[PDB]
Amino acid sequence: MKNPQHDASLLSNSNEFRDKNVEFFASGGTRTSKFDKLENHPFLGYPYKRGVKRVIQSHYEPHVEAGGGEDLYGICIDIDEFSKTATIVPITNNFEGYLVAKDSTVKVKDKLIFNKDGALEKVTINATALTDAKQISNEVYLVKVAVFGNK
Amino acid sequence: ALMKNPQQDSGLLSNSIDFRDQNLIFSNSGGVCTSSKDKIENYPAKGYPYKRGVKLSFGDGTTELEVEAGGGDDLYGVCSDIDEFSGMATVIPITNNFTGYLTLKKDGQNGVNPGDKLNFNQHGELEKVKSVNAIALSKAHKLTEDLFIVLASVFGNR
Amino acid sequence: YSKSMIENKVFSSCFKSKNERVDAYSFACSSYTDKIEEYLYDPANSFPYKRGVKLVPKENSIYVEVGADTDMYGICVDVCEFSCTAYVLPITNNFEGYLVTRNPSIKIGEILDINNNGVIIKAGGGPPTAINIYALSDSFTINSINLIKVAIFGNRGLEKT
After folding, report:
1. Helix (H) or strand (E) holding B154
2. Any idea which UniProt keywords this protein has (chain C) (predicted)?
3. A57, closest residue in chain C (CA to CA)
4. Which residue of chain B has the CA closest to A33?
5. A11 Cα distance to chain centroid
6. Do A149 and B37 touch (CB under 8 A)?
7. In A81-138, which ranges are E strands?
8. Residue C157 has what DSSP assignment?
């Protein structure tokens, strides 16, 4: 989850101001402009920090889920669990931030493609990696990228 | 040439009596018709990418990335202004459409006419025609024997 | 034709399904930071309202004329007939709204393409599509002009079939 709410018994020492931002709970983007277009959409699963595709079908309005390829629609940069809604940056808008990488093979200067699970994998091209993949926890790898569209 | 403003000074006072054909100067930064809802970025400048297509250029890793004149399959945006003191380049991302005066390749510049599709070369210069949608909206204008500028509209990727 | 289109002898007769009007507000979901541009259009060649348009630089001004997806500059969302001025949303921006189609039977979720007349058609016609267009609703006829709700988000990397 984006913010796993767990109670603690001791305070965690947090004084160093470096290597503090690469975390799974840091939503949004590293650099954001006031004129960035944002859309909230109903979602299924957990597409947080992943490429999202718009799925269209009691009939319901279209929702979004993790995906990519020819069906890529945007990027989910923030999520709200109570409302079950996800803030999405459309693919027509450039973005800079940390996204989910398939594995640790991704390095700097690497051109990346959103796979069927919304994860960034090495090689149409969509983004250019800026840093190496870092393991946040278990198999979760986060990579800083500069999304620019589709080739 | 290598500076947005004329490097040398001038020995005359401008007449400032006419209003037609006064925007052909090289120092005319920014777009000709600009929207208030335009996303604008800045980056450290490597070289002089002024009024040229820019691409991401990296280093060993000790320093942050910067932008240099370029194009083709590595095009990232268009540089419209540069602050020389800070060495910062104003960059308009390719996902945001642009309309203004851009540097034109000095090769077949006479053949360029309104309605001619253009594309960016490896040196960030517009050349007559792939993957970037650019349309010339005027004819080439000569500023220096090797410097030609043309009014063009860039509206994304093909 | 026109958008406003007239004195009536009597008034025309729930909240549901009242948006099915030719002169309805084009944007189903609007957003500030959407870029809107003004251009001239030909007042006798083709009426560009709710159609995909292309830039034609003429010898006197830059006009917008109905065009295909291959050379599309954007979508004409509104027209001021008094000044014959067309308002264009560039293709670089997202769109979600009602556009003119020529097929009266289009289902929801189908892939769509803009033809030479700036008209929504099914993407199975054969021309390689270059834009991501999806039908958000079934096509409806106003009695006659056919409209459909579509979502347009940027260009397609590799042209499909």
Report:
1. strand B148-157
2. Plasmid
3. C109
4. B39
5. 29
6. no
7. 85-90, 95-101, 111-114, 120-122, 127-129, 134-137
8. S
